[PDB]
């Protein structure tokens, strides 16, 4: 299927170059241009440049000349973008998108984006903790449980419940930064009669450290 596959979140040190991929599948790589788009967290979409793998021509947003270099390897159906001499201002999500070259000038299929966090800092895995009630209760028809995700760097982490099979009732809070470390939490609400009788587990992933934690929520 038409699909654009990008590398996972990365921490790089200031002053280094980082090269990121966008592996194409499900369509004719040399018939569509690849566009790159930048997004600082909670800020807008900003076009970087495009490439036409067929010819290898590149066109850039002026602001990214002297910063970004777009390439395409036809033999692997993979486009790459490369940022040089990075700074904290280059911390952002970078998307690739297939900007249709079938005359309808729009990008109809997008990658999942690569989060880049430029800092010197050590990349730290987080500690996951269960949030279970204190031995007191109210509004017992439903019960709320959670996970505390503390002391990681850099963003992002992923929290799911029972491998995505617990879907309803879930709030995952934006991370916030404490003294060079991130912290967030996730809440989940189930029928008071299903817990602890059937299991509830939060599944935390921190791509930047390749850490995957499963914390079963057990009472008390």
């Amino acid at each position: 299927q038409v699909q654009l596959q990008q590398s996972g979140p990365e921490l790089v040190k200031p002053g280094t170059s980082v090269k990121m991929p966008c592996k194409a599948s499900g369509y004719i790589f040399t018939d569509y241009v690849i566009s790159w788009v930048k997004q600082r967290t909670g800020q807008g979409l900003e076009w970087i440049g495009e490439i036409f793998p067929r010819s290898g021509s590149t066109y850039y947003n002026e602001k990214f000349k002297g910063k970004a270099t777009l390439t395409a390897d036809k033999s692997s159906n993979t486009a790459y973008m490369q940022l040089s001499s990075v700074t904290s201002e280059d911390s952002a999500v970078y998307f690739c998108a297939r900007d249709y070259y079938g005359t309808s000038f729009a990008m109809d299929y997008w990658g999942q984006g690569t989060s880049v966090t430029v800092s010197s800092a050590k990349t730290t895995p987080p500690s996951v903790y269960p949030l279970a009630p204190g031995s007191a209760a109210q509004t017992n028809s439903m019960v709320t449980l959670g996970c505390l995700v503390k002391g990681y760097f850099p963003e992002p982490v992923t929290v799911t419940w029972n491998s995505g099979s617990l879907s309803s009732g879930v709030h995952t809070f934006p991370a916030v930064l404490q003294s060079d470390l991130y912290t967030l939490s996730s809440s989940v609400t189930v029928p008071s009669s299903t817990w602890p009788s059937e299991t509830v587990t939060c599944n935390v992933a921190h791509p930047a450290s390749s850490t995957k934690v499963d914390k079963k929520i057990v009472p008390r």
């Binding site: 984006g113 949030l131 709320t144 505390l148 503390k150 809070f173």
Partner: protein, 218 residues
């Protein structure tokens, strides 16, 4: 060399309401071709990659329902949403393909809704955490509206005003509500010097705070 100007920056309507938003280019986006101004509208929901809704000013993309409608020409363009749904919560971007590309600043769509009060929960620190010289007390204020809410922590009745970290969720795409997290963080030894811990939620929906507490010894 073409700059894009979206307005308004932010936007709030109730479910079922019609809404419109504006996009202007510093130069005309119409080369020729009957129509085909090179102008596209994308919808970006929280934590998702953008989605193409309209191109060539007015042509709807495959699988896009008709309640989204693009219109306009030259340097003046509009996106309309009739019968707004809570699922539509997103930042809406216009992009210009005449020459290179330029995204407009975006318009945030916030949904207006019926006030509702938060369901509050309080959680004492885990055995594990109190095991690494850390004690975080966490208080969830879930499914409320509007987004204004103030939280007051008390330790043995004394309001506590630091070690407090707050975070608001995205407005929920299903019921248009907000939730919030407040985390009070102490050292273990500091936590072990008090008994009663309390979070108090003051929300427009009741002038008397919702109180949740526990005791360390509890």
């Amino acid at each position: 060399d073409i700059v894009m100007s979206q307005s308004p920056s932010s936007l709030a309507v109730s479910a079922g309401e019609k809404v419109t938003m504006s996009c202007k280019s510093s130069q005309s986006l119409l080369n020729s071709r009957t129509r085909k101004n090179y102008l596209a509208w994308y919808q970006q929901k929280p934590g998702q990659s953008p989605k193409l809704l309209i191109y060539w000013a007015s042509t709807r993309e495959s699988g896009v329902p008709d309640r989204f409608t693009g219109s306009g020409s030259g340097t003046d363009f509009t996106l309309t949403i009739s019968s707004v749904q809570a699922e539509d919560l997103a930042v809406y971007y216009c992009k210009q393909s005449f020459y290179l590309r330029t995204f407009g600043g975006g318009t945030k769509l916030d949904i207006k809704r019926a006030d509702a009060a938060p369901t509050v929960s309080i959680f004492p620190p885990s055995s594990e955490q109190l095991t690494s010289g850390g004690a975080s007390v966490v208080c969830f204020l879930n499914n409320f509206y509007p987004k204004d809410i103030n939280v007051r922590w008390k330790i043995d009745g004394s309001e506590r005003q630091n070690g407090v970290l707050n975070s608001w969720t995205d407005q929920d795409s299903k019921d248009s509500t907000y939730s919030m997290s407040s985390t009070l963080t102490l050292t273990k030894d500091e936590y072990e010097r008090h008994n009663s811990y309390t979070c108090e939620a003051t929300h427009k929906t009741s002038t008397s705070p919702i109180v949740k507490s526990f005791n360390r010894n509890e």
